Structure formats: structure tokens, C-alpha cells
Ligand binder design. Structure first.
Ligand SMILES: OC[C@H]1CN(c2ncnc3[nH]c4cc(F)ccc4c23)CC2(CCC2)O1
Length: 167
């Protein structure tokens, strides 16, 4: 039993809710919140900008030190950093950004990072300003992630389309 509330169950291990991931993280304090990161960990907008703003820019400060030491992530890759006031840990995952021309096949690799964590609160990778079809992202999630994932979808209209079209 865990503390996630109000989710619709899609499969054995995937759950979904119309929610603001920032507010959801603030209330649940999950072990892992996933950020929709880019390779430079520049958290300017979308989910990343919202999560970073909620940390009062501490996420960005930590991220800048990470990049200065380690260099950029790979598209499809991830790193574990602090969850600050939102979670124990933040798993920064880089899905492909269609608006930069990156290969959508890398979306499966991106979701594979979730399998290293037993339970996660996450957004749909490559959705929103990353330009992929969220219906496709949900399908890849369900077909790739085997650990327990709680998906937060900010847009109510999109949430209803994802549920109604789910096979
Ligand atoms: O940029 C659009 C991208 C963002 N995503 C999110 N998902 C879950 N929680 C979210 N909280 C936020 C707070 C923000 F200020 C900005 C974005 C989010 C967000 C999923 C979607 C939005 C509909 C599909 O796309």
C-alpha cells in the first residue's frame, strides 16, 4: 500500500491522474519524482521549469554543479539528484525532443530508466514542449516500465483523451 490517491489504474503497474506534478509531489513526498529534463539540465520550462521553480531554484543550482563535473546527459539517459522539498530523489530523464529532431525510438530507452526504481511519480516523457504525441508516450510507458509508475497529466482535456483512447 502507498499514499498515491485518486489514480485510475491502467495496467498491473501503471496508474494515471489529472494532476499538477508539482502539487502532487508536494503532497505525497514520493521517494522518486521524475523530471522531464534536457541533456544540459537547464530547467527552463515545461515540467522542468515548474519543478525547479517549486524548489526556489535549488534544483538548478545542484544541476549546474552536476553538469560542471560530469558533462551533459545522453538523450535517453538519466541521473539521480536530490528531490529537494518535493521528493527524496529526482530522477532527471531525457526523452527525445521532437522540436530538436531527436529520434523518437529513444523514448523507449528513456522509459527504461524508470525500471531502476520500484515506485515513481512521473510525467509522460517527451510530451508537452518536447513535441511527441502523448498517446504514443503512454503506450511506450506501459510497454516498457515494469515498476510502479504514477503518471501525472496536467491538462484535463489531454487526460480524458489518454484514458478514452487507451487500449
Ligand atoms: O509543457 C507541456 C507539458 C507539461 N506536462 C506536465 N505534466 C504534469 N504535470 C505538469 N505540471 C506542469 C507545470 C508547468 F508549469 C508546466 C508543465 C507541467 C506538467 C505534460 C504536458 C502538459 C499537457 C501535456 O506537456
Amino acid at each position: 500500500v502507498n499514499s498515491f490517491s485518486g489514480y485510475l489504474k491502467l495496467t498491473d503497474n501503471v496508474y494515471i491522474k489529472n494532476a499538477d506534478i508539482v502539487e502532487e509531489a508536494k503532497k505525497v513526498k514520493p521517494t522518486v519524482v521524475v523530471n522531464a529534463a534536457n541533456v544540459y539540465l537547464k530547467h527552463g520550462g515545461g515540467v522542468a521549469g515548474a519543478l525547479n521553480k517549486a524548489t526556489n531554484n535549488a534544483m538548478q543550482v545542484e544541476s549546474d554543479d552536476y553538469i560542471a563535473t560530469n558533462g551533459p546527459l545522453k538523450v535517453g539517459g538519466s541521473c539521480v539528484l536530490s528531490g529537494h522539498n518535493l521528493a527524496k530523489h529526482c530522477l532527471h530523464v531525457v526523452g527525445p525532443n521532437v522540436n530538436k529532431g531527436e529520434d523518437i525510438q529513444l523514448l523507449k530507452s528513456a522509459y527504461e530508466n524508470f525500471n531502476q526504481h520500484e515506485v515513481l511519480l512521473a510525467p509522460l516523457l517527451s510530451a508537452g514542449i518536447f513535441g511527441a504525441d502523448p498517446i504514443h508516450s503512454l503506450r511506450v510507458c506501459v510497454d516498457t516500465v515494469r515498476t510502479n509508475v504514477y503518471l501525472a497529466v496536467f491538462d484535463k482535456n489531454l487526460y480524458d483523451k489518454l484514458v478514452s483512447s487507451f487500449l
